[PDB]
C-alpha cells in the first residue's frame, strides 16, 4: 500500500501547478484521497478530497475557485492543480488516503516553491561587538549577510584561523523573497582593541566573495 508523488515544482507568482499521486497496493476507487499541505515550519493544512470512483470533490473554502482535484482511474492517479500561485503557497503537498474522514496512508509529499526572486549577492554589514556574558568576560560580534538569493552562503572567520565560538545561524526567508543570515563569534572582550575580526562571505551563485572587518565602533 503506497502513494507515489511527482517531483518538486519551481514556479513564479501567478502561475499554476499540477502535481500527481499514484496509488498502488489497494483499490484506488475504494477510498477518498485527501490533499494536505504544510508550509515551512508550519502546521498541516487540509485542502480537500476527491472520491476517485465518482470524481466528486470537496474543497476547503479557502481554496475554492483556485484548486481543482481530478483523477484517472485507468492509471490509479490523483491530481491537484492550484492556480494563481502566491509565495505563501510554498509548501510540501501531501496526498493521503482516507480510511473511513481521516488519513491512514500518506505520500512522501511534493514540494512546490513559488518565488519571484532572482540571483542576488548579499550585502554584508557588521554586528558590532556587544556584551555577551559579563561574568564570563566575553563579547559577541558578527556579520549580517543580507538580501541574497539563492541559498546557501558560506561564512568563515579570519580566513579559517578563527573557528572556536563561531555560530552561523540558519537564514530567514523575507517577504521580499530574499534571504538573510547572521554569523556571530563569541570572543574575549579584552581582545576587541587588539585582535582583528573579519568575516569571509562566499555566495557562489552570484560570484560574490567579500570580507567584512567588524570593528568595535558605532559610527
Amino acid at each position: 500500500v503506497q502513494l507515489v508523488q511527482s517531483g518538486a515544482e519551481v514556479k513564479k507568482p501567478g502561475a499554476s501547478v499540477k502535481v500527481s499521486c499514484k496509488a498502488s497496493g489497494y483499490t484506488f476507487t475504494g477510498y477518498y484521497m485527501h490533499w494536505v499541505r504544510q508550509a515551512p515550519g508550519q502546521g498541516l493544512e487540509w485542502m480537500g478530497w476527491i472520491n476517485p470512483n465518482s470524481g466528486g470533490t470537496n474543497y476547503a473554502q479557502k481554496f475554492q475557485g483556485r484548486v481543482t482535484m481530478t483523477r484517472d482511474t485507468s492509471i490509479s492517479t490523483a491530481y491537484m492543480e492550484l492556480s494563481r500561485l502566491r509565495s505563501d503557497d510554498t509548501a510540501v503537498y501531501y496526498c493521503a488516503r482516507d480510511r473511513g474522514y481521516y488519513m491512514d496512508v500518506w505520500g512522501k509529499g511534493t514540494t512546490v516553491t513559488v518565488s519571484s526572486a532572482s540571483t542576488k549577492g548579499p550585502s554584508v554589514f557588521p554586528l558590532a561587538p556587544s556584551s555577551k556574558s559579563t561574568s564570563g568576560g566575553t563579547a559577541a560580534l558578527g556579520c549580517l549577510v543580507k538580501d541574497y538569493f539563492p541559498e546557501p552562503v558560506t561564512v568563515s572567520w579570519n580566513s579559517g584561523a578563527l573557528t572556536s565560538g563561531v555560530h552561523t545561524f540558519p537564514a530567514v526567508l523575507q517577504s521580499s523573497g530574499l534571504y538573510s543570515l547572521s554569523s556571530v563569534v563569541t570572543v574575549p572582550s579584552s581582545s576587541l582593541g587588539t585582535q582583528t575580526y573579519i568575516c569571509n562571505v562566499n555566495h557562489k551563485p552570484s560570484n560574490t566573495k567579500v570580507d567584512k572587518k567588524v570593528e568595535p565602533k558605532s559610527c
Binding site: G121, S123, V124, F125, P126, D147, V201, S206, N207, T208, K209, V210, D211, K212, K213, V214, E215
Partner: protein
C-alpha cells in the same frame, strides 16, 4: 553580454563580485547599486585591460 568584475577596496569591506552586461557603462550601474547597498562611499576606477571596476575608500 559579457562578464565584468568589481573589486571593492573599502575601509572595512573588501572583496569582489561580477555582473553581465552589454557594455562597461551598464555594468558600472549594477556595481554602483551593489556598492551603494553595502554603504560603500568611494572613488571609482576602471581597468579596460581586465574588465575590472574598482571602488576604493580612503
Amino acid at each position: 553580454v559579457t562578464t565584468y568584475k568589481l573589486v571593492i577596496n573599502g575601509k572595512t569591506l573588501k572583496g569582489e563580485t561580477t555582473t553581465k552586461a552589454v557594455d562597461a557603462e551598464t555594468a558600472e550601474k549594477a556595481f554602483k547599486q551593489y556598492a551603494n547597498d553595502n554603504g560603500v562611499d568611494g572613488v571609482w576606477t576602471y581597468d579596460d585591460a581586465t574588465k575590472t571596476f574598482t571602488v576604493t575608500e580612503h
